[PDB]
Symmetry: D3
Subunit: 234 residues, 6 copies
């Protein structure tokens, strides 16, 4: 459970340091969080995939009882809403060619998010030139790694549309994380909480990305203390 | 000129009454004539001048905008139909997403292409969800939309709620220029109940009676062209 | 509920036409009323509804999205929204939801899903071009293509609350052109509405 | 007298693999068919292009004269139908972003197929990286070679939709054939006749693709 | 020859074209159907051999041009005099705009067939081609949209423009819209749709249409 | 007094191949843009293309005005959107992005901008616009499926389709800053199949790039990213 707003919780940490989140997939796990908190994670991301909304419920239920960091929903589809979470990344897949992933899915799930109490964090979601499975399923045109002006352009548009958070996604298991240059440019152009995930395995991966401008660092694939150490090194 | 935040000005008015905006098209008359229309429209007690509604030459836009910014003291707000709808002579821009388009260009593409320009200029950006209702008019057709049916307010509410969650503080229920009937009072009423958005309404609003129903139905802002 | 619903269907179709009751999500009372009214099954579409249990007719999931899969059901109309303009509703959603259907035991009935004018809400959310009521040649064309692709079931959807049900001409023509279990829904309120649809060729009626 | 092509296929699959030879009507030649049967092909696939339906008819007629194995149409558009064939791969290009290649073209060509007697084998058609010309013309998002889970997802969806055959397409002339992992995975997940084509030139390529799970191998 | 055939006639009067469908009657019956100035052959995506025989049957027995009116790549046949090589402009599907055309271009070049560049626009309600073509029919109350497309088509080099109400359409491409489109471009303006009565033809032709098509 | 731009082209094409210099208004001021033009003209460029980006039309006008004052070669608009129209130009490439998956870039944008082009005096040159691998930013923004470099038949197919639809000009686009220009084989095939003024841009930096591209069949050569480099390029094309 988490008493207060997750968004204020984020600003609270950001006064002093950078934020780390651990991404858990229910299909893969059985209702790791505790280990990642012993490493120094500041929150648990839950979802990322299209899977039956009951393995989610059980994993979500199990977590809310036993951990004291926020559970934030990371929906890969409308199957990603669960009342047992503390907040949801209410995201738009901005660089999709399919309106379903941009606003369609979002419209169908809004009543569910509202009927429940869940805090909704507005987030622009942008796939970078590898992109992993989400890039493919999300019908995206991945942003080339050497075209940061494009990423920055979408970051600026997201902000003007009211999205206070921006997520640079290289896709799960990306060989290399989002380019340092791309992150820096986005940080230069907006006042958004800049989140970066994908391909971040080593503390050095975390140092480069954190140093590049990222306010938040997401990881799914202790390794965590190595990572969180890395993000402190800068 | 207007100097201060157009959004605070809106909230200032909303404490006491509902807002009215006049939509002028640069394509349809000369800059002098629009000032005439504008200056005239201020006599009714309009609270601002919306400028756009069409995809047209960005030089007529500039010229009409310049002429207005000099001669009126109410806010000049851009109502862009494309990236051609941006001008530094305006006080704010409705930075809008055409939510029920089947084409990503009208949802995020155009917005992405014009954002650097909007930031390079000083223009204040009001985040706005833009939703076309049946019949949808010309913008419905050009915008590659599936107009929200008039007997499907649940759909309107669904997109309005999502817009809010995405950070869009304003919502525009658009029936399109020359709409035979304004957006149904039912749709407006439901949308107002479900969100904490400034609910803007345009399309087919001609008479005071239309304005009484639409405003009375829940609309915080009414637009007439 | 043992066992195959497709066999349950064929067994009945030997003697009469099938009726299915569509429940939208918890009042068991509605199912039981329609079951003593002589319905042959419960369609469940928009979520547990473990409440059967209390029923002895099949529970068939009628999904509006990937959120429509539940292990307490007996079968799923595993459907493709054929006349959608969005690949998501034709095969995309189906591909993302396929593993769950296999992970559970749920029997999957292959079904073509076709929206007819006016199309209702499913037509709109589904990004469809509803088949016009005076264009049955199109309906038949899609029924045949669906069948050639292996879809043994075909669903003529006018959308919930349709002012008029699917045209009689359209139903008849599709049945003449294929060897499918022909389901028709939308706008069916009166027995007379049910008389037209049933008489025209429909093997299954939904209300 | 003549048996169905699907039944013909199952008869072989009881004992051994299955091989089909892909002929393009546009590119030339009953010589090629006759030659490939002496090698041990089990059938002749006819198509691969969107091209005039007269080059097809003529090639189909000539073939139907000189061989005793099935002629199976492999259509690139509604122009790929000819009454001189024994069966048609009635396919949906599943990972296309364009509804025309998924169901639209199929809807337009259906009556023509019905008017003729042609046996229609229901087949899911999936383009794998790199994808070749069909990948480009077909408006596809090729399934990446290290994302077999995606391939398996579509094989399962195809099956649930009634498609008894599944075609893993790497595109004509692809440098690498569809990966063994993907083939292995897709065969594990469905009870479909699993066809695999593209880039299979050497005997080793066919041994690997066959060994990985492919029930049918295609060579053009 | 066929484009010149057209310009010569329009000097004095308006052109009329008769639309015959190969699917709907036998070639003998088709030769029979043929004061019309030409025979259009198509309207559908249909068996491509029904096309060939009907074209042959036509090509021998008449002295007016047989002009292909393709609904898809199945619509090219070597026995015709000309082809409307057309783009379905207000389609949401790139296949009907340029995709099909690219797939069919080599066939047209391989034959000698004369290709007339034509913008093809479905107007409300639009009929079957509008539906199959994945169109957003131009509303009957928006001639500005039609004209905008007529102008863009012309700038792209399309000398002919076709205002389509759809086969069997209950009502006209509207009087007006034709007028506006004619005012705004220098194209050979073709109109089809539910033109049934002699009264309809006076209206459509008089309104600005250079060409009237009837099936 | 002034000559249409297409006739200007035909005149040069009687004897030699054409060179055009592509300036982006966003990337430098009008003063600096005049410098590029004037330098590019002392090297034998035959014209100045104006566009290349989706950017506010006030930088365009100012760059366009400044040019119209100081040079006597034609100013041709190279629009990236309807914001790419300026009344101060001599002609516009009225183009369709043929291998886009989005109808907006194929005809939609063109339809919304047509009234403006007609209302102004601007000469409209009909042009098929085809993005080749890698495609650059326009390939990405334009929602394209870039023609693979080993698929000249695809390029030729669209070139043939463009011509039949009345498009007298064809542009093979490798994208700004492309590591390598459009393949020779691809250009050759496109020239063999049509009688279009065949334009090629992208990745053309050196005189050899231009010699090879020119030699392959290209009637026209566009270059932007790179001042008297032009003299090498125009030399190469001889
Ligand atoms: O590659 P990993 O570390 O699993 O990252 C997951 C990705 O979804 C974060 O955005
Ligand atoms: O009905 P009018 O007065 O044209 O106003 C409609 C306007 O909201 C369209 O943008
Ligand atoms: O109109 P009813 O009877 O509810 O039927 C609708 C159903 O077929 C689809 O939801
Ligand atoms: O011609 P190849 O490369 O063998 O490929 C066969 C077929 O699968 C391609 O359509
Ligand atoms: O059959 P009608 O309604 O006369 O029209 C046919 C032709 O106009 C179709 O383009
Ligand atoms: O690589 P450059 O020289 O900038 O050329 C690109 C230009 O041709 C865009 O089409």
């Amino acid at each position: 459970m988490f008493k207060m707003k997750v968004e204020d919780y984020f600003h609270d940490i950001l006064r002093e340091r950078k934020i780390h989140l651990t991404l858990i997939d229910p299909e893969e796990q059985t209702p790791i969080a505790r280990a990642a908190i012993r490493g120094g994670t500041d929150g648990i991301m839950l979802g990322g995939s299209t899977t039956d909304s009951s393995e989610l419920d059980n994993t979500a239920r199990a977590l809310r009882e036993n951990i004291d960091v926020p559970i934030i929903l990371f929906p890969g589809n409308t199957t990603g809403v669960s009342r047992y979470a503390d907040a949801i990344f209410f995201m738009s897949l901005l660089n999709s060619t399919n309106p379903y992933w941009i606003i369609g899915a979002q419209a169908l799930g809004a009543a569910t998010v509202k009927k429940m109490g869940i805090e909704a964090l507005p987030m622009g979601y942008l796939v970078v030139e590898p992109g992993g499975t989400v890039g493919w399923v999300g019908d995206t045109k991945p942003v080339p790694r050497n075209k940061p002006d494009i990423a920055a352009a979408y970051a600026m548009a997201a902000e003007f549309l009211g999205m206070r958070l921006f997520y640079l996604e290289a896709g799960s298991g990306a060989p290399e994380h989002v380019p340092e240059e791309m992150i820096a440019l986005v940080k230069r152009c907006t006042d958004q909480i800049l989140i970066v995930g994908g391909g971040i395995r080593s503390g050095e991966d975390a140092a480069r990305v954190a140093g590049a401008g990222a306010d938040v660092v997401v990881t799914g694939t202790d390794k965590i203390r190595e990572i969180v150490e890395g993000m402190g090194s800068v």
